[PDB]
Amino acid sequence: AEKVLCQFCDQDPAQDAVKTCVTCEVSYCDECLKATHPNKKPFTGHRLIEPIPDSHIRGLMCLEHEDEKVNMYCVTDDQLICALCKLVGRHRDHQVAALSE
Ligand SMILES: [Zn+2]
Ligand SMILES: [Zn+2]
Ligand SMILES: [Zn+2]
Ligand SMILES: [Zn+2]
């Protein structure tokens, strides 16, 4: 398992980061994410990497990439991303894992 634990967790044992805020430039778990991002909506003026909006059917799409769906995974963020994100550079130096021939 290559999942990063919530570095900003003080539960003992601590939790694991499943989400990441881009505007914060840090990866945290849902718990912390709850405190850091207080109720306000529609999204507390904070963006993320492939969030979980009211829209739910099968999978999830990127922030602004409908033509390209998420088919990659980022470790530093512990979330799912799209190859187009890793190409542009948003996740170039990021340690991800993709399929292999
Ligand atoms: Zn946490
Ligand atoms: Zn944030
Ligand atoms: Zn990343
Ligand atoms: Zn993307």
Curated annotation (Swiss-Prot):
Zn(2+) 1 binds at residues 6, 9, 29, 32. Zn(2+) 2 binds at residues 21, 24, 37, 46. Induction: A retroviral element acts as an alternative tissue-specific promoter for this gene. The LTR of an HERV-E element enhances the expression in placenta and embryonic kidney. It comes from the Eukaryota. Zn(2+) 3 binds at residues 62, 65, 85, 91. A zinc finger (B box-type) spans 3-52, 59-99. It is found in: Cytoplasm; Cytoplasm, Cytoskeleton; Cytoplasm, Cytoskeleton, Spindle. Phosphorylated on serine and threonine residues. In the fetus, highest expression found in kidney, followed by brain and lung. Expressed at low levels in fetal liver. In the adult, most abundant in heart, placenta and brain. It is linked to Opitz GBBB syndrome: A congenital midline malformation syndrome characterized by hypertelorism, genital-urinary defects such as hypospadias in males and splayed labia in females, cleft lip/palate, laryngotracheoesophageal abnormalities, imperforate anus, developmental delay and congenital heart defects. Homodimer or heterodimer with MID2. Interacts with IGBP1. Interacts with TRIM16. Has E3 ubiquitin ligase activity towards IGBP1, promoting its monoubiquitination, which results in deprotection of the catalytic subunit of protein phosphatase PP2A, and its subsequent degradation by polyubiquitination. Belongs to the TRIM/RBCC family. This is E3 ubiquitin-protein ligase Midline-1. It comes from Homo sapiens.
